[PDB]
Amino acid sequence: YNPSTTNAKDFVDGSPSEFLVDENIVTMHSPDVEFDDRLQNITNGKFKL
Amino acid sequence: ITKDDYNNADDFDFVGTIHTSSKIEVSKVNGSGAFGQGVIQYAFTYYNK
C-alpha cells in the first residue's frame, strides 16, 4: 500500500479475508520429526540451514 | 608390600584418602536420553580396584 494515500487498516479492510504466501517463514517437514518424538520437543534450537 | 610410594600415615587406613581438590560440575543436556519425571542428585566416590 502507498502510505501517503491510505493507512494499513483502511487498506486491509478492502479484503481482510485475503491470504498471502510467505517464503520468509517456512515449515520444514522431515520423517525424523514425525517418527522420532525427541524432535517434537525442540524449543528455540540454534541451528543453521 | 609390593608398593614403595607410601608417603603418609593415612595411606594405610581401611578408608581411602583424597589428595586432590576434585571439582565436579553437573549440567543438564536436553534432547537426547530417556529419563523419568522428577529430581535427580548425583553422588561420587573414588575406589581403588
UniProtKB/Swiss-Prot annotation, chain A:
Top-level lineage group: Viruses
Subcellular location: Virion
Task of the protein: Forms the muzzle assembly at the distal part of the tail. May serve as the gatekeeper to control the ejection of the cargo proteins.
Oligomeric form and interacting partners: Homohexamer.
Protein name per its UniProtKB record: Muzzle protein
Organism expressing this protein natively: Bacteroides phage crAss001
